[PDB]
Amino acid sequence: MFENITAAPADPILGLADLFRADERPGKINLGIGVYKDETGKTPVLTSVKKAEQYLLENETTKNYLGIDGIPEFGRCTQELLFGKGSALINDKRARTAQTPGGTGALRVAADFLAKNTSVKRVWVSNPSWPNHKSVFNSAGLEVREYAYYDAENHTLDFDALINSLNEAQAGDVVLFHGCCHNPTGIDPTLEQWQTLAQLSVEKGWLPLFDFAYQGFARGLEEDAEGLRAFAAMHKELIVASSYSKNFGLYNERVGACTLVAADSETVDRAFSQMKAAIRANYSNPPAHGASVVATILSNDALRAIWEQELTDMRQRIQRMRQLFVNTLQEKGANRDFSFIIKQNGMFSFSGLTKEQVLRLREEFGVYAVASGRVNVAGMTPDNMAPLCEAIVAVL
Amino acid sequence: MFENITAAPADPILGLADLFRADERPGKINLGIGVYKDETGKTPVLTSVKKAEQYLLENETTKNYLGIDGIPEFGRCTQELLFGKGSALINDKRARTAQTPGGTGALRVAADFLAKNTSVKRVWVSNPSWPNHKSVFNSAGLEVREYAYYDAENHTLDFDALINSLNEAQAGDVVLFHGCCHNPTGIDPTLEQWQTLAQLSVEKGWLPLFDFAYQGFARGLEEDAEGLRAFAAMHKELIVASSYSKNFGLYNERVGACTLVAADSETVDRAFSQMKAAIRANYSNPPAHGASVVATILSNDALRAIWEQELTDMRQRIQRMRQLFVNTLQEKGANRDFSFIIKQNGMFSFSGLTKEQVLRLREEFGVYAVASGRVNVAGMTPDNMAPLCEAIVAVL
Ligand SMILES: CC[C@@H](NCc1c(COP(=O)(O)O)cnc(C)c1O)C(=O)O
Numbered sequence: 001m002f003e004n005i006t007a008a009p010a011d012p013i014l015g016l017a018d019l020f021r022a023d024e025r026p027g028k029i030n031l032g033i034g035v036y037k038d039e040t041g042k043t044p045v046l047t048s049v050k051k052a053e054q055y056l057l058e059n060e061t062t063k064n065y066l067g068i069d070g071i072p073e074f075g076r077c078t079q080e081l082l083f084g085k086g087s088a089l090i091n092d093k094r095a096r097t098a099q100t101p102g103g104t105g106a107l108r109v110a111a112d113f114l115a116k117n118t119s120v121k122r123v124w125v126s127n128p129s130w131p132n133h134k135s136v137f138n139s140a141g142l143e144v145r146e147y148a149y150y151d152a153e154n155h156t157l158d159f160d161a162l163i164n165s166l167n168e169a170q171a172g173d174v175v176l177f178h179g180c181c182h183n184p185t186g187i188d189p190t191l192e193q194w195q196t197l198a199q200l201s202v203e204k205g206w207l208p209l210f211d212f213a214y215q216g217f218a219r220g221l222e223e224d225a226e227g228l229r230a231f232a233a234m235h236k237e238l239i240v241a242s243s244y245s246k247n248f249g250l251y252n253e254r255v256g257a258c259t260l261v262a263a264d265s266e267t268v269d270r271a272f273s274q275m276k277a278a279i280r281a282n283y284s285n286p287p288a289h290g291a292s293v294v295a296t297i298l299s300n301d302a303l304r305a306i307w308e309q310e311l312t313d314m315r316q317r318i319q320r321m322r323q324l325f326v327n328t329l330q331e332k333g334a335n336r337d338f339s340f341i342i343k344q345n346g347m348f349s350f351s352g353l354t355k356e357q358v359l360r361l362r363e364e365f366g367v368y369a370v371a372s373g374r375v376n377v378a379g380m381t382p383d384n385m386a387p388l389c390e391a392i393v394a395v396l
Numbered sequence: 397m398f399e400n401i402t403a404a405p406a407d408p409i410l411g412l413a414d415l416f417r418a419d420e421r422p423g424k425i426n427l428g429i430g431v432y433k434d435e436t437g438k439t440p441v442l443t444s445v446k447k448a449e450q451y452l453l454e455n456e457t458t459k460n461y462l463g464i465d466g467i468p469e470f471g472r473c474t475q476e477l478l479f480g481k482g483s484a485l486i487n488d489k490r491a492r493t494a495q496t497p498g499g500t501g502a503l504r505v506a507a508d509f510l511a512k513n514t515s516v517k518r519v520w521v522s523n524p525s526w527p528n529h530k531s532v533f534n535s536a537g538l539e540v541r542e543y544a545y546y547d548a549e550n551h552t553l554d555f556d557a558l559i560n561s562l563n564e565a566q567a568g569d570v571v572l573f574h575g576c577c578h579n580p581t582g583i584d585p586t587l588e589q590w591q592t593l594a595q596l597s598v599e600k601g602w603l604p605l606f607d608f609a610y611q612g613f614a615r616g617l618e619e620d621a622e623g624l625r626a627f628a629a630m631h632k633e634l635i636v637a638s639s640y641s642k643n644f645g646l647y648n649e650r651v652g653a654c655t656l657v658a659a660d661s662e663t664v665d666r667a668f669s670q671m672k673a674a675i676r677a678n679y680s681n682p683p684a685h686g687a688s689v690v691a692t693i694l695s696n697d698a699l700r701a702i703w704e705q706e707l708t709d710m711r712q713r714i715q716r717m718r719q720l721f722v723n724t725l726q727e728k729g730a731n732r733d734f735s736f737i738i739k740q741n742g743m744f745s746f747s748g749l750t751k752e753q754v755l756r757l758r759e760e761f762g763v764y765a766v767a768s769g770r771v772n773v774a775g776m777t778p779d780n781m782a783p784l785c786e787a788i789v790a791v792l
């Protein structure tokens with residue numbers, strides 16, 4: 001039955017490193033991998049998680065199954081991280097959280113939930129946006145419609161085009177936001193824009209679905225939640241898919257959550273039972289390790305403090321690499337102006353390179369980057385910044 | 397949009413312990429939880445895995461993402477465990493293995509694969525069979541059709557009814573087997589029966605889908621693979637979903653594999669790329685921990701030896717509990733005869749209790765069991781065997 005199967009095409013991101021891991025070229029920079037790398041170009045395991053793993057190794061007495069929703073302390077903590085402490089929806093018990101295999105499994109879980117328990121047919125993802133969004137939503141049978149976003153000229157957020165594009169979206173439609181550090185533009189709404197987006201959202205009656213994966217990478221854990229908090233303040237219902245892959249360096253342990261906010265405790269339980277149903281049919285229960293490492297780190301003040309410092313070292317390092325990048329380019333020599341780069345949050349930014357330039361780079365200079373011209377700033381070290389900018393300026 | 401959601405009904409297995417965990421009753425036995433428990437009624441973490449976790453804790457230098465298919469050594473090892481060493485399909489390179497979140501995620505992965513890349517509409521699950529099978533297959537959009545299995549009278553495998561029921565299944569249909577320790581009957585085909593089932597399978601042209609979750613619990617790692625090996629010898633293509641949850645006590649780490657056997661290396665790669673595609677849309681990459689604990693334990697001879705001994709202590713303990721159960725019942729006093737219990741493999745067996753008896757037990761005697769009258773033998777200790785059999789005999 002497999003003799004006629006069509007070979008799948010390469011993923012726009014993976015198929016980059018998978019090839020990178022073949023181009024011997026000495027000096028081969030890589031800016032694809034939306035994974036963080038320190039000043040050494042290494043993706044270490046945070047000390048806090050390292051300490052948490054020792055504690056676990058010593059205390060765990062069993063591997064017996066977790067509830068379908070995962071670890072209680074986990075859900076509770078992510079709740080407070082997202083909605084805040086003393087947040088109404090917390091105190092009222094309007095939310096329910098489920099531990100899932102990473103932020104993607106939270107998406108797939110939201111999708112399947114929606115897809116079989118509601119009258120949702122379309123999802124509105126921005127343009128551009130993390131590629132896998134569409135694939136995930138489509139696999140559930142849902143339709144994906146793009147709302148404009150990037151001002152290719154001024155290198156900014158085109159609020160006008162956005163709203164104008166969003167208006168066509170009907171009520172009862174899911175509009176997907178990026179809590180912070182927009183993949184791949186790095187441009188995020190201001191609180192003001194967010195605050196209006198939350199108003200026009202209740203009116204038109206969309207169903208928010210925040211994809212929060214880089215909390216703490218723009219301005220800090222709390223500041224980064226302003227948006228999700230603005231909507232949460234206004235809506236009776238919402239969904240949020242968060243991931244601990246980055247802000248915790250837990251990439252391969254697949255740890256994230258899917259938080260259902262409904263209008264009242266009574267219904268949030270009903271809606272959640274069906275969510276659990278989706279999960280039970282997908283993977284049964286989530287993986288305990290990475291989640292346990294997160295519950296303990298967050299419920300322990302010594303460990304949380306160390307962690308909370310590591311996150312900011314990461315955050316601060318990427319922000320040093322942004323301006324170093326701007327300055328270095330402006331130094332090598334030529335007409336240009338990448339000052340906008342300094343205004344974008346997170347690990348990514350839109351280089352503003354043509355698909356062609358990008359190939360001249362990753363083939364004549366081995367400097368790898370994603371076709372869209374997206375470059376992972378958190379993969380830049382002070383030692384590769386020179387040949388890098390040389391390559392770039394050379395292809396301008 | 398959630399105000400009219402229908403509250404999901406309770407799962408036939410979970411909703412048992414979830415209530416058990418509320419019935420204070422001193423002496424409250426529990427036979428639901430298809431999870432293993434030692435002579436103390438504890439589900440410990442094996443020593444081998446404990447040692448493997450220390451090694452990991454010391455050596456792991458990164459948490460960076462795994463390939464979509466998981467850990468190479470993992471896939472390679474599970475391959476040799478399943479098909480054998482020097483097995484043609486291994487040497488020929490006709491198989492591809494992907495690490496998934498437990499045996500269930502392997503199922504869901506096979507399903508989604510089939511569901512979108514082939515002309516498969518129906519799956520044939522036995523009667524009875526692990527409940528979640530249907531839910532999983534249905535969530536993918538596939539149809540589930542039951543083929544007879546249990547001889548409620550003689551307490552045996554009704555080969556006749558089976559074949560007779562299977563014949564209606566068309567070609568290009570997926571027939572799902574249980575490699576060993578049939579949930580919930582404990583009755584498994586003989587090699588002879590298996591060997592014929594493999595012949596009639598090629599003719600009618602079904603597409604095998606073995607659900608292997610209790611390897612090593614019937615007669616030992618190798619003996620337990622006779623079946624999957626019989627089919628593998630005969631078919632050009634097959635799929636197998638294995639789980640390390642039991643034979644490794646890794647329940648909550650979600651570690652299993654989905655092995656695609658095709659007719660040749662060239663196509664198995666094509667078929668696999670699409671499988672990876674399904675995964676990428678579901679959870680992206682698998683959880684590394686539990687899988688790492690398994691690769692190292694199996695690739696290290698000292699650790700494998702310790703583990704390989706632990707598995708047999710478990711296997712041997714359940715087999716002591718079967719005959720102790722038979723003898724004790726026959727001792728308390730009454731017309732009956734549970735000798736068939738001694739002939740069933742694995743942790744389960746069909747008590748042969750009416751839904752009524754089962755309620756008299758778990759409500760007048762607090763002795764919990766699944767409505768079907770399925771009882772987890774690996775939850776019986778020499779210390780609870782007395783009141784247990786008293787309860788049972790009392791409801792005969
Ligand atoms: C998978 C890595 C990808 N970023 C991961 C990612 C996720 C979820 O990933 P997780 O499952 O690993 O939590 C969700 N949402 C966005 C916008 C992401 O960029 C990238 O290359 O940007």
Ligand SMILES: CC[C@@H](NCc1c(COP(=O)(O)O)cnc(C)c1O)C(=O)O
Nearest residue numbers: 409430498499500526579607609639641
């Ligand atoms: C989930 C526990 C269940 N047995 C688990 C189980 C699985 C996969 O479970 P896993 O994902 O945890 O690997 C697959 N197949 C069978 C026949 C099972 O009994 C039981 O109560 O029998």
